[PDB]
Amino acid sequence: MFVSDFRKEFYEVVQSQRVLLFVASDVDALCACKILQALFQCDHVQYTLVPVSGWQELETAFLEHKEQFHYFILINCGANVDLLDILQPDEDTIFFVCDTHRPVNVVNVYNDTQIKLLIKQDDDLEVPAYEDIFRTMRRRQRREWEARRRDILFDYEQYEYHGTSSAMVMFELAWMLSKDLNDMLWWAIVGLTDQWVQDKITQMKYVTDVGVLQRHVSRHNHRNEDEENTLSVDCTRISFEYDLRLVLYQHWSLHDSLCNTSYTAARFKLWSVHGQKRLQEFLADMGLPLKQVKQKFQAMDISLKENLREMIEESANKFGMKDMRVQTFSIHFGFKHKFLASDVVFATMSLMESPEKDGSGTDHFIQALDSLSRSNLDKLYHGLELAKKQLRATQQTIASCLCTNLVISQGPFLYCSLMEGTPDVMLFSRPASLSLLSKHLLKSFVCSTKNRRCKLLPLVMAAPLSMEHGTVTVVGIPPETDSSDRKNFFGRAFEKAAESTSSRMLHNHFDLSVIELKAEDRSKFLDALISLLS
């Protein structure tokens, strides 16, 4: 069932109870977890928090914890599968699901007693009616009904996508509880910006949600400040910004940010030998000295920093980059700490997807989660350093793939693969960073090629996972277009291709468009996908 009011029939229920949080390892999940943590700590709710990153891990943790806890909250996981089938719970347990994944599984939708969904009912949802999904001429009519059922269920389950941010949902709950702090609002903003950075949502939906959060920012600012008398410099001040699309440009030199932003790198073809000259054309059009552009931004001359955004916008317009400016937010506190929401997103993501072989992925999750609090600001800066390394490695990998021409058409989709032992393949072994790399690589490819048909294709990308088990991760990306809905069918396509091939596919990740394959299975699996997409 959908929860109609989070306050009464979710929060006031669990407020009297011991709770278990399962949280996915993504930045939106981390922000929603932080908001809910702060609420529970205000109300002395005895919660336990468990990270998870796949179905096997969630099943293991639930089997470990099922006896002691009756109330469970799943953040950014569980909505798009039958939780009762997967977990096999006792009937007295209750699962709250604040998950952005769409479409919601019909069993979770119509299970009234046990599965409760912390999902907005005014999100883009098209759930089929109950009578269409659940129960001689009567036999013929029944078989016709079953044919209708399979057709409508395939139409419902074909495309997966993402709804409103879980962090935004939790901040809505905090606002209804009248316990919303400025830091909670910042976590909500970072949660939305995670979806925008990873291209999980459309630009229109992102603009709408930014319009929602603008009102909350204005309310929080005018809560205790006006234009006549102001707060201490120590206090956090969140400001709406119509800022630049360039990544981490306030902590870098502008040259590095123009080099490693996927947008500008794809436009100017900076992987190519000619791309640096095109970048120099752009910089000379702006009139910025190269010794200033290659200097760190905080050390750049303030005469140049005065109107840099207008300069970059108006040069980008005539160079063909039509949407260089983006609606976003920034947070200021103290004298010297200034971050964009995209900066916090990249830092936390790099901490979580860090390639270091220390401890465990749960350890990297813990470092990422700690970095979202201002008492652990050093972790945030360290995450920014890791983001520098990650973005440089991303551009190196894209340059390698395009120069050696690993990205190759195979009919209805482009195909690419990373070989073992190549530079910085370890950084993209993990599925989430691989999905991000595939998106950036597809943007670079469609900006590079002259073939108008190839600009319309989706991308399938693979990389090694475990040589000892002989497995590869595989991800599927929809076509990269300006007006895409960011819906993709590769979940069901992978499932149906694997079933039609009897392939050894482990479906452990929460996105259905991310899978693990036994490596030798890839040839017949790819052939099946080619025959399927046709």
């Binding site: 205000c42 316990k179 702090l181 205790n224 008398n229 707060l231 201490s232 410099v233 120590d234 206090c235």
Partner: protein, 176 residues
């Protein structure tokens, strides 16, 4: 004694809060408090004030002495005098730390308040340094430190007392 323990004693000081909740009078062992009426000021110990502010259950009001004009006058008087002047509170440094770190949003001009309190702290610790040096140089038998606060004494007193124990035994080792 640790600085956390001096803060623990400082947390007993009374401050005024404006609750956003309703609660009748509560009979604590150290003294009854309340009733807590929404939107009306009520005086509570500082630990409860900080706890309720952390739990988003009240707005803290600054003490009467957390005022930029009064604090500037106190700072100038402290710098002008040679002896330690009477401070507005016996735990002013700890009050400043707790109230400004937890409720800078409620307290206006918290930067000025913090800087003036730091000025007074620097001046009075300098005076205490001078007093310790004069004690050891002149071989005094006792000193008078009327207006020092407990945190100020605790910051430097362990070293000073140990040094004076050593000095006393050195100057008395010819007792027969």
């Amino acid at each position: 004694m640790d600085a956390a323990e001096v803060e623990f004693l400082a947390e007993k000081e009374l401050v005024t809060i404006i609750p956003n909740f309703s609660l009748d009078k509560i009979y604590l062992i150290g003294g009854d408090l309340g009733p807590f009426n929404p939107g009306l000021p009520v005086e509570v110990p500082l630990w409860l004030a900080i706890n309720l502010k952390q739990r988003q259950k009240c707005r803290l009001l600054p003490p009467e002495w957390m005022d930029v004009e009064k604090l500037e006058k106190m700072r100038d008087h402290e710098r002008k005098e040679e002896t330690f002047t009477p401070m507005p509170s016996p735990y002013y440094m700890e009050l400043t730390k707790l109230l400004l770190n937890h409720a800078s949003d409620n307290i206006p001009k918290a930067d000025e308040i913090r800087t003036l309190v730091k000025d007074m702290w620097d001046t009075r610790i300098a005076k205490l340094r001078v007093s310790a040096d004069s004690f050891v140089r002149q071989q005094e038998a006792h000193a008078k430190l009327d207006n020092l606060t407990l945190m100020e004494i605790n910051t430097s007193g362990t070293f000073l007392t140990q040094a004076l124990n050593h000095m006393y035994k050195l100057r008395t080792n010819l007792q027969p």
